[PDB]
Amino acid sequence: SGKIIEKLDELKKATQESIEQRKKFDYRIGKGLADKLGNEKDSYFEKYLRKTVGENIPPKILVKPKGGWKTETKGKGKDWGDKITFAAMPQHHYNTLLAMAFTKAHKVYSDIRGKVEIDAAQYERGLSGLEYLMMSKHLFSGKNSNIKLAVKKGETEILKEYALNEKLIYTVLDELRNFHSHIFHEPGPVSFKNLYGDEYKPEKKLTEEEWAIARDWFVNRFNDAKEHKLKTLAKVLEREGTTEEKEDAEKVIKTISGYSFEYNNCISREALLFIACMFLRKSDAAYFTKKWTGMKKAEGVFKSTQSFFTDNALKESKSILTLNADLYKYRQILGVLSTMPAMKTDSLKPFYDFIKINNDSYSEKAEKARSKEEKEKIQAFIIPQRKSSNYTYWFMKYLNDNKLLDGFRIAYYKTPEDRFMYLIHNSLTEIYKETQRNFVFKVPTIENDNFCVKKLNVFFQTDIEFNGQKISVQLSVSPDFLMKWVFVLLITGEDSIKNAITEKKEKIKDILKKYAEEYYNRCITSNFNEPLMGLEASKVFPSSLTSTVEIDEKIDKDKILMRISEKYNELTKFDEENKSRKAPWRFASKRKIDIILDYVHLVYSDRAFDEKKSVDAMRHEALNDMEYMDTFEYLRYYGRYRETEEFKKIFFEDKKLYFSPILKAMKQLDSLEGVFNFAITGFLNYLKGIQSKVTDENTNKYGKVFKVTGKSLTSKIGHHSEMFSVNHCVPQELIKLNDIKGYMKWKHETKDKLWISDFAFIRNVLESRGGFSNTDYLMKEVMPLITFEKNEKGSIKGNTQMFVALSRNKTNELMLWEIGKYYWKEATGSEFSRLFKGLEKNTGNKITKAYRFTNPYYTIYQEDLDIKIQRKDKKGKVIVNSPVYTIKIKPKKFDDEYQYYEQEHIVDYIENYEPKKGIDGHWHFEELNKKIKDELARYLDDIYLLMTVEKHIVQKDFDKYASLLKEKDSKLPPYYIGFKRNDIALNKVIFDALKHKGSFSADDLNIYRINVLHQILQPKREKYIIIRKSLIEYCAENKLLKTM
RNA sequence: UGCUUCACGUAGGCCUUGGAGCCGUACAUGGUUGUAACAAGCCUAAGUUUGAAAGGUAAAAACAAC
Ligand SMILES: [Mg+2]
Structure with a gap:
């Protein structure tokens, strides 16, 4: 065992050098006004610490310039007379944040891995198979496009390799946590090596002198992110600006250029944060990033400096609500209805043009104002513009x-x-x-x-x-x-x-x-002539079986000149509506790629028809389904998949004849938007070129290439009747609103309306009950301000598609709130009794009725909610019998991260602590959140105090601690600090140390240490204060801190 | 000490998701050739909340060959 004991001496030397050099927990404070303390620069931090344990230290520091100055040597912007007051807390070292981050990361990742395990077990240790399919949904921000393409093809080959990679990265994360949570530790996970010994290893298989593939994966991800951010910042750089964001972009590109996975011979600070924020929750990674970086509120370019660590994160899929389900559905319906929809039907273009002009004129008037109350008096006219409009989803949710x-x-x-x-x-x-x-x-x-x-x-x-x-x-x-x-x-x-x-x-x-x-x-039995039920004879039974010609007619030239013209103006409309957006590279993916592929397909079809090829010669020269999927995958992620071998394997070779018009310009531009404007310009040029060559000789020339066909065939009815029978469609007027109270009176009252339908009756009925509809504001306050260009006879062009679409909006809104009203019946147990006012015509030069003050749903969206905060146990178990608490929660902050944060901290702060109910008599979410985050801000201070105390303990008696790790038939884990060792312990060592106590326990200190490691709220506030005060006094006894 | 951060802790402070041109879960999203527009859109009645009937564009959902 001479080689074994030599391994003990070399590991002891490595541990001693690691503790002496890299185990620094040195806090540091900012410059400016914080570094002006001078003499109390020597004594600040514990003077803060006593303030946050209960002692009365007055802030009697009121240093002034004391006179009027003319020279620039004074130069102080001391317009705030109050000093530090020992309440603000300074920046801590990266080791404390890394210890908390790795403990929280291991907790959340073990929870997610366990959830994925039980989900895959009930649905039918590296999570092999569909376990990695769920884990790859969870692992990054939806970045499993290659895995999705692989399961769409059917390869099932990358999954096992990715499973090994995930298991290895999980073991690396576990070992990183075990290093960072402890003081007495080998320098293993920071500088990736095999100091353990490579032969004596009881399942501590970190690297085994061969798992530098973990390092390869780490540099691969780090460098991918680095060059991706370099490309993005290069694209921002050459944008227009007022020579102020140019210097900010220069600062950001100075910060990103650097970093790297390796510094000297260690991982260093940036890559550790990269791994931690990769393995954390999104909000936890954001919090640790804004604690690590000195920037509080990131604006403009600087979000990228946050985003470098928050690009990967974790997915965190949706949460199943059990208490406030119907109230959340009511909140979602109200959030949908509080927004003006964006209808793409034309002749409403002046409406949205005036809306955009008004919003752009009032958003600049939102600035150059005073305070926050006067800002809303100008912001109240700005109309939100909606996102989804899922009427069918809400109808099907109601059913x-x-x-x-x-x-x-x-x-x-x-x-x-x-x-x-x-x-x-x-x-x-x-x-x-x-x-x-x-x-x-x-x-x-x-x-x-x-x-x-x-x-x-x-x-x-x-x-x-x-x-x-x-x-x-x-x-x-x-x-x-x-x-x-x-x-x-x-x-x-x-x-x-x-x-x-x-x-x-x-x-x-x-x-x-x-x-x-x-x-x-x-x-x-045929019968396509008689009406069906009472609907019609033609509202069912499409033109494939009703209208027919015996002989397929010759294709006329005017049909071709109509198809070419409609394709040209559709492409022009898409091009104008894509150029109208502020960020054109975010509009669509199924539409931008398909335009390019239809362009190359039509050019190929003309070039292969005028050269007179065969039938199967077209198909094998075209794109197969797997080749289509590969083309769509490599075009969607053209910036990522540009330099791989598959790109040049399937594009520049093997398919050079099909992709001929685009390979000339594909060697210059490096984006999806680069290869889109060229393709649409080529499509417009080609349609303009072949529009003028549709003479009678070139009639069959532009025939089957354009797929222009007339009516059907009489003999093609019996074959259609066996395939249109199953899989037909249901018209909207199958059911009749005949026996509804008010139908006959409505039909008698509205008789001089020849173009009326049942939707007018639905509008009348649901407007009898009272309710906003998002269209009364559109045609009584903004519409009379706009002048419309007429028609040849009508005063407005495009009448039959102007009002109808508006009506198609209006009753739909009158549907949706009705559904929302039902959820209020499921929310509070009482009916919705709020009265809603009507509307009048504007008849004025300007617009006077604000959208945020006249839409009632937008007013309800800003006024409170009721909630139940009965606690929930682990897994999908039922709610336990606990006291139920109600707080006043805004509907805006009622999303899924609130549902996580509530069960994380809010219930334990309400129950274990003793908050005051306030003036109202019910707790408020803002005060609760402020108090919880303020009580959690001091938590890294606590872990800094514990690490300093333990470092002072282990710096003495180093040979004493090293002598109690001999062998366990092999090399033991070299860490000794676990606070529960059976031979000499460490919490007992601090217990009989200089810690003064009157009410204490070693088990209480262990519970306190576990809580500050895992960021869980303390059971008793008063005992925690006693432990904090004892540790403050023990640190101040030995002059441990740099504040001494 | 140090390759670091210059900021005095916590909570607050909204049109069109710029900084994610390579993210993402609320879908025309799996191709070529013939048959396929009942359903969903888009144009054609109206200085006002009239989605009927009609006339073009339109292939979502489906059938046969690779
Ligand atoms: Mg109609």
Whole structure:
């Protein structure tokens, strides 16, 4: 054991050198006014510490210039007469933040790994298989595009290698935490080596003198992020500016240029923060980044200096709410309704032009004002512009909450885990067809809201019973059918409708089932001429079976000149609406790539038709499905996938004939936006070129290349009747609002309206109850201010698409708040009794009624909520019997990170501590958050005091501590500090040390140390103050700190 | 001490998500050729909250060859 004991001496020397050199916990304070203390520069920190333990130290430092000055030597901007007052806390060393960050990172990552493990166990140690599919959803900010492409192809080859990599990086993170939480430790995880011995190793397999692949992965990720930030900052640099953000960009590019994974022979400070913020939560990484960096509120360019550490982070998927579920749905509906929608229908272009002019004129008037109360008096006219408008999702959520979907099947979005299960679980063409589809049918439950919205449509499945057979029929329900379903629910409870004969109650699900059966039985026996039920004969049965010509007619030139013109103006409209945006490189991905690919496909099709190739010669020269997926993947991430071998393998070779018009310009520009403007300009030039060559000789020239076809064939009816029978669509007017109280009076009152529909009746009924609609403001306060260019006869151009779309807005808003009102019935137990005022015409030169003061939903969105903070245990267990607390929480700060923060700290601060209820009588979220974060700000101070005390303990008796790590049939872990060793201990050593005590325990000190390690709120505030005061006095006895 | 940060702790302080041109979960998102526009859009009635009927564009969802 001579080599073993020699390993002990060399590890002891390494540990001693590490403790002497790299285990510095030295705090440091800023310059300016903080460094002006001079003599009390020698004595500041403990003078703060006593202030934050209870002692009365007055801030009697009032140093003044004491006179009037003329020279620049005075130069002090001392307009704030108060001094430091020993309440602000100084910057601590990186080791304390790293210790807390690695402990929190190991906690949250072990929690996420355990959750992924139980999810994959119930759904059917490196998380191999679909375990890494969930873990790769979680690991970065959704950066699993290569893994998604691999499971879409079916390779399942990168998953095992990525699983090893994840296991190795988890062990590296665990060893980094175990180093950083302790004082007496080998310098292993900082300078990646094998000081353990490489032969005597009881499953401490950190590196085994071969896992420099962990280092390779670390430099790969660090350098990828570094050159990505260099490219981004280069793109910002040459932008326009007032020579002020140019110097800021120069400072940022000075900071990023540097860093590196290796400094001297160690990982150094930046890469440790990179690993920690990679393994942390998003808010935890942001907090540790803004504690590490001196910048408090990052603005302009400097967000990138934060973002360098917060680019990866963790995903943190959505949370399942159990107490305030309906209140959260009400808040979401109100947040949707508090915003002006952005309709893309033209002839509303002056509306949004005036909206943009008004908003740009008032956002500059928001500045150059005084205080915060006068700012809102000018900010109140700025109209928010909405994001989503998911009317179909909210309708289907209302039908899901009341369990109105029974005996059905609803298409839901496809997950990568479902794709992998379909891959491992396997007529081959049926499986190939199901593989291409991105939706799946399953029985709807309450806890499922992944509804498939494909161009505002939803998909249903019905089980009609022709001759006892179980023929499943897919439908496609229009968004104006579910809206009428919600109306029939919301007017008459226990919904029913009556038909033309015997006037029964028809139970709309049974109406849909009978309609599917009747459509099947009518398609099976032609009958496309008679009307169906009472709808029409042409509102069902499309033009493939109704209108037909016996002989396929010759394609005329005017049809081609119309198709070319409509494609040209559609491309021009897209180009103008993309150039109108402030950041053009964020608009679309399915639309920008498809324009380029349709351009190259049309150019290839013309070049291959005029050269007269074959039928199969087109297909094998084109892009296959896997080749399409590769093309879309390498075009979406063109800045990342530019220099790889696959890019030049599939683009510059193997496919040079197809991609011919773009390879000339692909060697100059280095972005997706670079290869988009050239392609759309080439498309416009090509359409303008071939528009003038559609003479009668070149009629077949621009035929099958453009896919222009006339009407159908008479013989092609029986084949269509066997494929349009299943998978047809449901029109919006299948159900009739005949027996609703007020229908006949409305039809009698509105008789000189020849173009009326049931949506006017829905508008009248839901406006009888009172409610805003987002369109009364649009046509009574902003509309009369704008002058419109006329038509040849009409006073406004584009009438039939101007008002109708507005009506298509209006009743939809009158739907949505009604649903929200229902959730208030599920929230407080009482009806919504607030009265809403009407609106009047403006008839003035300017606009006087502010959107933020006249929209009632925007006023409700800023006024309080009720909540229940009953505590929750681990896993998906039920709420335990605990006292229920109510606080006043704003609806804005009611998102998912509040749902994490509440169970993290708010319940333990309400229960264990004793807060005051305030003037109102209920707690407020702002004061609670301020008190919790103020009580957690001193926590790294606590760990600094503990580390200084332990360093002073282990610096003496170093041979005594080293002699009690001999062997355990091999090399032990060289760390001794664990505060619970059975031979000599360390909490007992501090317990019988110079710690004065009257009410104390060694177990209490261990509990306090575990709490300051893991950032958990203290059980008793008073005992924690006693421990803090004892440690402050013990540190001040031996002159341990640099403040002595 | 040190390759570091210049800032006196905590909470506050909103149009179009610039700094993420390579993020992301609320979907026309899996290709070529023929058949496919009932559903969803987009244009055509109106100085006002009239989505009917009609006339063009329009391929979401589907069938047969690779
Ligand atoms: Mg119509």
